[PDB]
Design a protein around this ligand. Sequence first.
Ligand SMILES: NCc1nc(-c2nc(-c3nc(-c4nc(C(=O)O)cs4)ccc3-c3nc(C(=O)O)cs3)cs2)cs1
Length: 319
Amino acid sequence: TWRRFDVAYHDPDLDRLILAARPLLSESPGRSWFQRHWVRGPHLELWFDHPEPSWERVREVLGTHLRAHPSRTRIDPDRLLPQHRRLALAEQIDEPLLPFYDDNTLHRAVPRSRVHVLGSAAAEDLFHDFHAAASTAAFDQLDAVVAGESRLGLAFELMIAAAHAHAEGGITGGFVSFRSHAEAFLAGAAGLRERWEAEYRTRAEALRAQVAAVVTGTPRGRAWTGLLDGFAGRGDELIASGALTPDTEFHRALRANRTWHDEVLRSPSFRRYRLLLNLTYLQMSRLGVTAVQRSLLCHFAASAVEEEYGVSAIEIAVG
Ligand SMILES: NCc1nc(-c2nc(-c3nc(-c4nc(C(=O)O)cs4)ccc3-c3nc(C(=O)O)cs3)cs2)cs1
């Protein structure tokens, strides 16, 4: 059902290349979407379930761009291969990892299946529907970033909006997830945590204001939560049928808290929230936000909500 094209582009800043692809994902019927990926080296993937654009049309648009604005980053294959072998085990990727693509090249590629990770073809199809809708939204987000808006700031707004609209209890409920994710990432890194805290202090006033603005309602926040709304029903149904599948002070506390077990973890509302937050994190990846940066945002979001509302995620976890 799907066609895939890989654009090998070794500079981590894909944003202009993505914007050049906008007509290909905007001009013909069918679902189309893009993501960033690492197999055979850094590359952009374009996915289509209908027969247009053709390979020839894809080359007409993106060949022109690669010749005008080529990547000048050089990969280090010797260091990348072992990293990719580990990623492949972790992400359950069975595709060949070699040879690495040459920089600034276009390829047809074989679409991969994620059923074994997501739980069913129906769950995979729902993620494809999300990607199709979200990729359209991403072009406007990336136009803003290229134009000079803060990438992390746009992502922060998506996260706050998702927690306020889609968590039970709104922002002062959903923010506990942000702490959880930051503390799981940090895995005992006191020195990194202190660096994050010190940067957060410089940002606090602006970040608290952004939290209050998003909670009041912003056009971007409402647009993102509107998009997420489209997946809530089907998501609840796949979660309920089974079709959609840390040693830290915080997580130790949580594991001893019976409300976590009985009213949070197993609740359909938390499962739904967590699905829609995970879709938000996928969007952040599409927008070029790395795993460390997503985890920093989680730290900043939790800290901002705590300061604005005078609440404490660790106190909630302890119970
Ligand atoms: N002493 C009794 C109590 N314990 C709790 C707890 N709530 C949580 C909680 N945890 C996560 C978490 N998310 C993660 C994650 O990894 O995503 C871990 S904990 C997300 C959200 C909540 C809350 N929901 C609400 C709501 O009003 O509905 C408020 S706080 C953990 S213990 C509430 S009252």
